[PDB]
Amino acid sequence: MNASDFRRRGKEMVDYMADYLEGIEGRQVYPDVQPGYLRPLIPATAPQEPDTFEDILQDVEKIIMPGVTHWHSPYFFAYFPTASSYPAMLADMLCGAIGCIGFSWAASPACTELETVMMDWLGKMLQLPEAFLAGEAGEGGGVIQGSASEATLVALLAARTKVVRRLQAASPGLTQGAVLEKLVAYASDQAHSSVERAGLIGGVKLKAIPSDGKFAMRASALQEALERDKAAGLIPFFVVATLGTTSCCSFDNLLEVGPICHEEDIWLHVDAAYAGSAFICPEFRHLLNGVEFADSFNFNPHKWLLVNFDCSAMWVKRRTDLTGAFKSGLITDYRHWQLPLGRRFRSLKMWFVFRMYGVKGLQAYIRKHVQLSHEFEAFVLQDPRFEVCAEVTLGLVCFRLKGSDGLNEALLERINSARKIHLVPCRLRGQFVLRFAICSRKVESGHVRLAWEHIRGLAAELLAAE
Amino acid sequence: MNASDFRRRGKEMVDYMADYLEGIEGRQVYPDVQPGYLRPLIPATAPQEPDTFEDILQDVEKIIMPGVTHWHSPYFFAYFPTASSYPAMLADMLCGAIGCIGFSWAASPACTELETVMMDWLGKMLQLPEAFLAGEAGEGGGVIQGSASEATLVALLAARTKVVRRLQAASPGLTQGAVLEKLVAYASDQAHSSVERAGLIGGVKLKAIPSDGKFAMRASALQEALERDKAAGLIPFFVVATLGTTSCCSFDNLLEVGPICHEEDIWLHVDAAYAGSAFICPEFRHLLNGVEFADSFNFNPHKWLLVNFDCSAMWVKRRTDLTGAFKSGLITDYRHWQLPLGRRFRSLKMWFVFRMYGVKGLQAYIRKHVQLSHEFEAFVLQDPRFEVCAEVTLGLVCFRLKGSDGLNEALLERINSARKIHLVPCRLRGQFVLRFAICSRKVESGHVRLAWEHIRGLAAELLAAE
Numbered sequence: 040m041n042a043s044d045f046r047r048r049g050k051e052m053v054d055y056m057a058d059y060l061e062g063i064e065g066r067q068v069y070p071d072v073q074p075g076y077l078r079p080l081i082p083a084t085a086p087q088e089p090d091t092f093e094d095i096l097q098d099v100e101k102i103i104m105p106g107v108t109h110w111h112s113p114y115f116f117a118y119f120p121t122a123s124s125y126p127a128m129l130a131d132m133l134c135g136a137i138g139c140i141g142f143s144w145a146a147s148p149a150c151t152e153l154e155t156v157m158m159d160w161l162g163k164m165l166q167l168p169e170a171f172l173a174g175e176a177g178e179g180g181g182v183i184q185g186s187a188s189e190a191t192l193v194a195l196l197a198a199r200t201k202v203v204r205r206l207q208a209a210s211p212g213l214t215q216g217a218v219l220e221k222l223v224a225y226a227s228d229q230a231h232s233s234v235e236r237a238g239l240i241g242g243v244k245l246k247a248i249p250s251d252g253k254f255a256m257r258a259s260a261l262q263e264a265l266e267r268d269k270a271a272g273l274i275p276f277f278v279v280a281t282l283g284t285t286s287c288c289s290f291d292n293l294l295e296v297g298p299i300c301h302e303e304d305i306w307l308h309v310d311a312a313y314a315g316s317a318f319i320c321p322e323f324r325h326l327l328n329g330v331e332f333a334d335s336f337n338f339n340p341h342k343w344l345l346v347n348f349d350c351s352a353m354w355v356k357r358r359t360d361l362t363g364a365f366k367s368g369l370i371t372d373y374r375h376w377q378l379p380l381g382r383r384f385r386s387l388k389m390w391f392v393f394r395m396y397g398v399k400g401l402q403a404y405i406r407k408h409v410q411l412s413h414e415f416e417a418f419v420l421q422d423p424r425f426e427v428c429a430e431v432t433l434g435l436v437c438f439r440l441k442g443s444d445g446l447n448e449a450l451l452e453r454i455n456s457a458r459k460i461h462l463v464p465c466r467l468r469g470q471f472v473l474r475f476a477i478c479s480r481k482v483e484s485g486h487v488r489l490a491w492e493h494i495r496g497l498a499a500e501l502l503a504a505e
Numbered sequence: 506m507n508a509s510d511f512r513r514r515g516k517e518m519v520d521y522m523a524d525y526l527e528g529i530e531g532r533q534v535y536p537d538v539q540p541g542y543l544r545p546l547i548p549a550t551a552p553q554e555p556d557t558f559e560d561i562l563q564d565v566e567k568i569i570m571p572g573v574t575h576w577h578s579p580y581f582f583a584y585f586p587t588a589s590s591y592p593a594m595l596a597d598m599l600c601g602a603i604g605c606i607g608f609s610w611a612a613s614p615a616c617t618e619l620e621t622v623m624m625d626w627l628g629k630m631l632q633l634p635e636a637f638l639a640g641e642a643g644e645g646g647g648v649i650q651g652s653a654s655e656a657t658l659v660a661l662l663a664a665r666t667k668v669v670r671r672l673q674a675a676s677p678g679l680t681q682g683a684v685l686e687k688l689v690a691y692a693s694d695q696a697h698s699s700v701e702r703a704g705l706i707g708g709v710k711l712k713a714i715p716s717d718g719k720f721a722m723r724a725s726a727l728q729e730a731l732e733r734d735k736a737a738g739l740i741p742f743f744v745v746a747t748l749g750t751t752s753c754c755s756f757d758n759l760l761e762v763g764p765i766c767h768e769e770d771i772w773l774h775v776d777a778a779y780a781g782s783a784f785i786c787p788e789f790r791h792l793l794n795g796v797e798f799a800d801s802f803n804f805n806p807h808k809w810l811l812v813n814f815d816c817s818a819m820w821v822k823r824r825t826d827l828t829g830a831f832k833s834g835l836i837t838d839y840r841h842w843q844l845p846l847g848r849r850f851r852s853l854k855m856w857f858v859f860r861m862y863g864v865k866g867l868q869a870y871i872r873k874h875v876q877l878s879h880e881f882e883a884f885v886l887q888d889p890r891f892e893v894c895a896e897v898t899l900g901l902v903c904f905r906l907k908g909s910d911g912l913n914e915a916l917l918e919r920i921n922s923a924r925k926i927h928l929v930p931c932r933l934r935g936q937f938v939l940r941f942a943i944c945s946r947k948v949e950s951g952h953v954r955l956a957w958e959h960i961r962g963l964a965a966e967l968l969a970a971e
């Protein structure tokens with residue numbers, strides 16, 4: 040294919056993309072295909088000779104689309120949002136055309152330089168402490184990671200190297216392996232499974248801190264764990280505090296946990312994968328208070344800030360703490376800030392989104408989602424057959440039918456079966472709970488109301504049947 | 506920005522992209538900007554209100570482009586190729602529009618299913634042993650990794666878990682940490698630095714095996730290392746064999762190393778990042794002989810098979826050996842095959858590239874690059890002031906002016922300073938060598954001839970001046 044054919048097909052593809060997202064309400068959110076559906080529908084071998092673009096697009100529609108779960112449908116209320124915005128898509132187009140691999144500064148100066156500035160822009164939007172900004176002369180700075188899962192692992196490895204060096208300074212005989220046996224990392228019992236993965240890869244013990252009645256990590260529970268573990272001769276080296284847990288979008292208490300990590304010289308990583316986007320709005324920024332105690336802070340623009348995956352945003356206060364694991368002001372060498380060596384020009388996506396929405400546009404997006412969340416909450420609160428199971432702060436409502444877990448499992452099954460909307464459950468303290476997450480860029484009140492009416496109607500049939 | 510504006514700007518962007526790649530010969534390959542050039546040219550803060558798309562595109566041209574190294578210029582002869590093809594760009598567009606995160610089967614069946622099939626397609630094109638194919642009932646299979654650097658780490662972690670379990674089976678009291686102290690990994694002295702990073706992250710010793718006169722790892726040198734290390738009480742657990750080293754595109758001898766790894770129960774990972782694309786051509790497939798002994802095999806379509814970054818292709822014989830690190834036939838759960846949990850629909854890029862080029866088109870691309878490589882070799886061989894420093898097999902020629910390293914350092918400086926072409930050096934056994942790598946999709950004979958005439962003319966001035 041040459042530039043001239045690309046001019047034609049590229050424009051066709053633009054129309055296909057826009058048609059897909061514009062017409063997405065008409066698609067069934069969750070597929071009816073069984074596991075294994077695809078292989079028998081396409082050839083066992085790559086073609087010797089080219090297929091036409093037309094044949095491929097037909098296959099997209101007839102073979103791929105039936106096996107797609109439509110994340111961007113208004114009726115997708117599962118997990119947390121993933122980002123989809125046209126500015127991000129435009130940037131990704133340009134990103135691919137430039138097509139540099141920014142494993143060094145010389146491989147494309149702008150690929151590195153734009154990223155540092157975008158991380159400063161975003162740092163300032165979040166009102167991060169200045170310690171996290173690169174600027175002209177900062178020791179800190181930010182980096183795009185592929186994902187929060189990777190960010191957490193990066194932070195864990197930096198923390199591991201750091202505590203190892205601290206110990207080996209005092210006892211030069213000590214091997215990495217002897218240190219590893221003693222190390223212990225902590226996270227909330229509501230922490231994302233990415234934390235456990237990081238612990239497994241990092242070769243360290245990971246212990247869960249019991250959350251309080253609001254599913255938050257607190258000083259007292261951390262302190263208790265630390266005392267027990269220190270007395271057994273273990274060395275706490277890393278804590279992940281989660282702002283916006285997956286289960287119920289609860290918030291670890293950084294103001295309590297931060298001082299403890301400072302006094303014990305424990306690396307404090309803040310995972311705000313979802314919730315972090317909200318901190319660009321002043322009315323939510325209080326939830327990030329205490330981040331000044333963190334060694335590293337991460338959230339995903341690719342969840343809730345309209346920057347298409349992959350784009351996870353991580354900042355550190357001390358670049359040498361980070362870069363030491365992998366060996367001020369201007370960053371030339373992002374390869375020491377992340378697991379891979381290669382990277383693409385992902386910062387274009389941030390620049391386009393930030394410039395095309397503006398801060399105000401992004402704030403309006405967040406606030407609309409939170410309003411819709413509360414609109415759904417209001418429905419649930421006014422129905423005495425249901426209960427809300429946790430405080431609603433952002434775009435997630437946890438709710439259930441009053442009654443047994445079985446009733447709620449049956450309700451979920453009926454919702455899934457009806458194929459109008461897609462939701463997933465969680466367990467909160469052994470209890471089965473339905474999650475309603477505001478996801479789509481295009482969700483409106485009307486969608487939420489119809490989702491609720493749909494849920495309420497199924498619940499009514501279920502309750503009569505009992 | 507809504508669908509309607511995207512239809513307009515998306516098409517503008519398509520034209521911008523095509524203009525960039527079509528006109529790319531007119532760009533200076535390597536930029537003149539100094540580190541830190543960008544920050545003063547753009548604002549310190551995100552805008553409150555939207556900027557226009559026009560202003561953004563102006564900035565791309567006037568501020569970004571001066572800091573871009575043009576990987577896709579015909580006159581870029583640095584490193585190894587990175588992939589740029591219009592079919593891959595079309596797929597990436599669609600990938601972003603669908604916008605699923607394929608962290609589970611239910612998150613989008615096709616996102617997982619298409620990938621397994623494309624890895625089988627690619628496996629068949631490379632004539633991999635059947636042990637590596639998923640098919641209907643295979644224990645093995647393939648996965649897209651973000652990069653070869655990540656693939657190598659994934660393999661190392663799987664290898665680490667496997668040997669750890671073996672050692673704990675004999676000695677159940679042994680901690681992960683006590684095992685780590687004993688473990689030793691090996692790679693060629695020409696192995697890519699990704700291997701050392703994998704060893705560092707994985708917490709294990711990495712030792713270099715001395716390469717032979719053709720910069721190849723051989724049985725005798727491996728065996729000697731193993732015997733020495735075993736007698737010191739170390740436990741070999743992982744070997745990376747490199748097909749297509751960065752320095753001089755040399756090839757480790759898999760037929761020799763494979764049996765040794767089998768007999769010693771050492772995990773054998775094959776890194777064919779660059780060279781692996783050539784193995785779809787029968788005349789190069791012999792270089793992969795012995796891969797039947799490998800536990801894992803990896804190469805980058807995002808180097809030399811026209812699948813834009815990110816797309817690294819990894820296969821294993823035994824999915825449970827891989828899966829066990831992160832805890833037949835149909836794969837539903839790629840999250841146990843890679844470090845991140847999240848992933849996008851990257852397999853679209855493979856499908857589009859393979860379908861729009863066909864196997865024959867891909868073969869023709871590889872063969873044309875290899876012919877151009879030999880054309881450059883032929884120029885060097887006819888000029889008695891120069892020498893070729895290693896066997897030319899694929900798209901890389903190592904060459905130097907006969908004389909001192911300093912003369913060749915000066916020649917490189919003159920080339921870089923003239924800003925017509927971009928090349929990088931290496932050291933081969935302490936000797937300074939220039940590398941000429943065929944990179945751009947659009948390189949032709951004429952570009953290679955002009956590059957050589959340019960190089961020869963600089964050398965002439967340098968030699969007269971001495």
Ligand SMILES: Cc1ncc(COP(=O)(O)O)c(/C=N/N[C@@](C)(Cc2ccc(O)c(O)c2)C(=O)O)c1O
Pocket residue numbers: 118119120121122185186187188189231233281283284285310311312313339341342348351606608845846847
């Ligand atoms: C609190 C918390 N911490 C870390 C992570 C890992 O983030 P990742 O590695 O994916 O960037 C998650 C992840 N959320 N996982 C979802 C909500 C699925 C999901 C949805 C949208 C996405 O854009 C996405 O990447 C993943 C889940 O259901 O687990 C997290 O919530």
Ligand SMILES: Cc1ncc(COP(=O)(O)O)c(/C=N/N[C@@](C)(Cc2ccc(O)c(O)c2)C(=O)O)c1O
Pocket residue numbers: 140142379380381584585586587588651652653654655697699747749750751776777778779805807808814817
């Ligand atoms: C033998 C060998 N093994 C592993 C890797 C890691 O590959 P990655 O992690 O990037 O996928 C490389 C990498 N090569 N690096 C280049 C040639 C630069 C380069 C050029 C084009 C790219 O598409 C790319 O990703 C990287 C170098 O000069 O180091 C490798 O050569």
